[PDB]
Structures are given as structure tokens and as C-alpha cells.
Amino acid sequence: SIPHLILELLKCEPDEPQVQAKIMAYLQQEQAKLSTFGLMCKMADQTLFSIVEWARSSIFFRELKVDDQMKLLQNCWSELLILDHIYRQVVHGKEGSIFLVTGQQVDYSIIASHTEVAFNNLMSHAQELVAKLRSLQFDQREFVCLKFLVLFSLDVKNLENFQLVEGVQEQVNAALLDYTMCNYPQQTEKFGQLLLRLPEIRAISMQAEEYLYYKHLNGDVPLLIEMLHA
């Protein structure tokens, strides 16, 4: 019961089991000294490296010239970093625990200590989104639809091939609603409530950057900064 468009953009998805392997390997064997904070950074930096590679090799997006691609990535990289995290908590994560991009499971309270107060307002608001998507039955199909909805947003201005970006968003919006009425009809008002999260994800990402930017100037940070300092 899957619209043809959604089938195509599922083929663009990264292979998770090996994605988790590279990052686990980069972190551990490429350590020959980083604190508890310096991991969560280089991990998110490697997560970001993967998200960028997913983007510039995926359908439609690969049509654009480098200029447009970069304007697109500048607007939403942090939202894609948090959506990736949010979604990893929906499928693999379970309350009182956080699932990392390494297969590693860490407790909520264990990481509530290893990081300061502001950071715990994040994650806590992030798990509110995790909970709402969980009751809504937010699956892989609607997930990969939100990614492109985040990658191709109307808010981005001065785009060269604005036309194509206008198209993709409109069609993924169409394929999504078509899908989530078909697959979750008893859960009637689903399409709207999962569209309603895109400002919320844009809100958490905005705090994530403000936290991460402070920490940079505070000297606590070792491509993740490159994207911010632009």
C-alpha cells in the first residue's frame, strides 16, 4: 500500500547496519584523549557526514548543482541530525534509555549527569517528540517522507532551480498524505500531526545549535563546526 514516489526514495536510504559500523570503528580504533563530551560531538559529526552523503547521492537532490545543494544543507542539517536521532529512539530506543548511532544503548539518567542542565532540556524535549511519534505509529515510510520534506523546504530563498524544490515538496506532501490515510485510517488525523512536528524539530535544532556554538567558543569542541560557522 505504498505510493510509487515513496518506494523510490526508500531506495535512497543508507544501509543502517554498516552505517553504525563505520562510526563505531572511526570512534574506537581511530583513538590512538577525548572526554565524554568529545565523543557525542565526533559521533554527531560522523552522523552528519553520513546524512550529507545520503543527501547528495539521493534521487532528485542529485539533479541540483552544488550551489543549490549547499543552500539546502545550510538550512536543515541540524534538523536532519535531530530527526535522525528522534527516529532512532522511536524504533530502537526505549524509556530511560537512549540508542546511539553505534548500536550502543545508554540510560537517560546516566547521560543526565554526564552533561549540564541546558543539554537536559534538549533530549527531554526530544523524548517528548519521540513519545508523540510513538503513539502515532510513525513508521519508516512516513519517516523518509519527512526527511525530504526537511531537505526541500519552501523557506529556503534565492534558489537557482527553485522549481524542482517546489515540485519535490509538493509531491512528497502528496505521497505522504496518500500513504498515511491508506496505512493509518483509524488513526485519522495522523498526516496533520506529523506535519505539525516539523516546526518542533526546527525548534530543538535551533537550541541544539545555540548549545553547540557556546561549547565551541568555550573550548569544549574538537565539519560539524564548519556547518555552524556559516
Swiss-Prot record:
Domain comment as written in the entry: The C-terminal extension (CTE) loop competes with a DNA minor groove anchor of the nucleosome and releases entry-exit site DNA, thereby promoting opening of closed chromatin.
Gene Ontology molecular function, alphabetical: chromatin binding; DNA binding; DNA-binding transcription activator activity, RNA polymerase II-specific; DNA-binding transcription factor activity; DNA-binding transcription factor activity, RNA polymerase II-specific; nuclear receptor activity; phospholipid binding; RNA polymerase II cis-regulatory region sequence-specific DNA binding
Major localization listed first in the record, in broad terms: nucleus
Keywords of the record: Activator, Chromosome, Developmental protein, DNA-binding, Isopeptide bond, Lipid-binding, Metal-binding, Nucleus, Receptor, Transcription, Transcription regulation, Ubl conjugation, Zinc, Zinc-finger
Record's function text: Orphan nuclear receptor that binds DNA as a monomer to the 5'-TCAAGGCCA-3' sequence and controls expression of target genes: regulates key biological processes, such as early embryonic development, cholesterol and bile acid synthesis pathways, as well as liver and pancreas morphogenesis. Ligand-binding causes conformational change which causes recruitment of coactivators, promoting target gene activation.
Effect on the protein upon substituting H85A: Reduced activation by the synthetic agonist GSK8470 without affecting activation by the synthetic agonist RR-RJW100
Tissue: Abundantly expressed in pancreas, less in liver, very low levels in heart and lung. Expressed in the Hep-G2 cell line. Isoform 1 and isoform 2 seem to be present in fetal and adult liver and Hep-G2 cells.
The keyword Chloroplast appears for this protein: no
Subunit record text: Monomer; Binds DNA as a monomer. Interacts with nuclear receptor corepressors NR0B1 and NR0B2; repressing NR5A2 nuclear receptor activity. Interacts with nuclear receptor coactivators CTNNB1, PPARGC1A and NCOA2; interaction takes place following ligand-binding and promotes target gene activation. Interacts (when sumoylated) with GPS2; interaction with GPS2 onto hepatic acute phase protein promoters prevents N-Cor corepressor complex dissociation. Interacts with HNF1A. Interacts with GRIP1.
Amino-acid positions noted as binding a phospholipid derivative in the UniProt annotation, renumbered to this chain: Y211, K215
GO biological process: acinar cell differentiation; bile acid metabolic process; calcineurin-mediated signaling; cartilage development; cellular response to leukemia inhibitory factor; cholesterol homeostasis; chromatin remodeling; embryo development ending in birth or egg hatching
Effect of T47V: Reduced activation by the synthetic agonists RR-RJW100 and GSK8470
Ranges for region AF-2: 223-230
Residue ranges of every copy of the NR LBD domain listed in the record: 1-230
Compartments it resides in: Nucleus; Chromosome
UniProt protein name: Nuclear receptor subfamily 5 group A member 2
Organism for this UniProt entry: Homo sapiens
Family: Belongs to the nuclear hormone receptor family. NR5 subfamily.
Single GO cellular component term: chromatin
